[model samples]
Target chain A: PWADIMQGPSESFVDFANRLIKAVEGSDLPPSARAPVIIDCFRQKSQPDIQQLIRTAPSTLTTPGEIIKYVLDRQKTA
Target chain B: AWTPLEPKLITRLADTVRTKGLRSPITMAEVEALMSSPLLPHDVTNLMRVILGPAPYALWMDAWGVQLQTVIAAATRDPRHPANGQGRGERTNLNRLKGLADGMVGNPQGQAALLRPGELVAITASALQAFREVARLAEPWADIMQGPSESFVDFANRLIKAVEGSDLPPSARAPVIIDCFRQKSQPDIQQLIRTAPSTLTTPGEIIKYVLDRQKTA
Candidate 1:
């Protein structure tokens, strides 16, 4: 369920992000709704350090692509 | 590598096929994946014998159009396809095994594994493999740390039991197993076990010293 979606303790953030997209992929939710809902959901469920990273990222994170790319880049460096 | 695990899955699959006959619910990809293993042609043939039971082996071989010896060669193309070099590899033989469907590889009919032409990177029968031998990967591993009140010997015993019970393949198993204890918990034992052997190597000696040391000193 959308309400119950959250990152699992052992699951990586990359897996969590892909899961969010998959959950919204089939729904009839509008394009605009997906980005905010997924972003808001990701932010709310994230750990403190992760929440800080999302809050402080350069782009303000409106679209799913932006956050996805940001996290992908962060992962590459890490 | 035929083991108890291999035969168990093959037996169940064979019985399922025997039960269903034409509607056996087996897939060509599944068969090909089962054949695709570190197992040799004869090894695969022996497994097929188990799957075929009393039914003549050559009969299914001819029907499925697969020869045990050439299966590895046939499924290969530039080290990937497991495809024939010639376009001669036709679908007619395998199509029958296609889960009761005659056409389309776009999205293979049933949930069994799929093999494509020149499909080099195949991991078809990960399904056939059930519960692993190494219990380390199978068991929940994160919470084995020592608690504040737990004695060094008690926690050591608990960790030792877990490792032995799991049957993890031996390679520094004891070293890492003992080290999972926090440094702050027992620095003297930690130093002696990890850094210097102190004639106290392996879980046996480490635990023995803990008990014997407490026994007198």
Candidate 2:
């Protein structure tokens, strides 16, 4: 399922996140494991600077929801 | 007592008719009536000719050209004339007069021909101020073209409208707009513009080519 999580050229972060969540939900992953899997997928797909920002703010952005919010906010400003 | 109209009076009346007739509710018959006692038939005819004459060269490149043309057409009762706000809505006549007046005042030679040294400095300053305001009005289009959000085609459409609305002649305007786009465009678009074929001479063609390639991209 992670193999299909490629980002679109002009896709907004919110759009990519929604598609990623949908792809994860359609997979065989359990509800308990889904959040961590989604977070890992997001980390793998993000640019290096975004990954670094997430690493640098680990305490504030502990949840997948928080990470997605941060990415979307960054996209809006960009 | 009827007096022969002075040349100055005829000239002034001609200017007033030329400048104000389109917007004024005053009819040609009313104008004729106003001058009937003092003006000879030839004087009235000459004034009508002045009123309906070709627009000043200064107005040709300005945004007000269409409005000025409409006014002339209306005054002349051109059969194919478009509606010119005679009764339908807010009258545009006064605004059109202002635009023509501004064109004359801002035109250096036009102003020079009409003003003496004592009055020239003050009048020219006001004309310069008015000219600055016109340029400011045109500035926003330049700003929009330089912005990142719109599609190339949409931006080109705006650029085309802006050029059409400006006082710059097509010969001068095209190169200026093209240069502005070159400076402000994204790298890929700039590259495409640089290598675009010689056949794409007009700003429209160059912009359309950029838009077409961007669509493919």
Backbone steric clashes in candidate 1, count = 6
| Residue-by-residue lDDT tens digits, candidate 1, A1-78 | 665767776666656765666676547888668767877876787555567777888777665545654554464232
Q: After superposing candidate 2, which stretches have Cα over 4 Å from the reference?
A: A1-78, B1-141, B197-199, B215-217
Off by over 4 Å in 1: A75-78, B1-217
> For residues B1-217, could you state the per-residue lDDT of candidate 2 as single tens digits?
2233466755765576566653243433334444444322223234434543454213222533343444555544633323233453423332233323443433434533433332222222323233233333523446644445566766666666566556687578778777767766766577666665454566767765665445222
- Candidate 2 residue A68 C-alpha distance from true site, Å: 44
| Per-candidate DockQ vs. reference | 0.02, 0.03
TM-score of 1: 0.25
Candidate 1 docks with a DockQ of 0.02
Score residue B117 of candidate 1 by CA lDDT.
28
Deviation (Å) of B202 in candidate 1: 57
Over A38-62, each residue of candidate 2 has an lDDT whose tens digit, in order, gives: 8877876755445544543323455
Report the number of the highest-lDDT candidate.
Answer: 2
Tell me the whole-model lDDT of each prediction, alpha carbons only: 0.48, 0.52
Model 1 docking category: incorrect
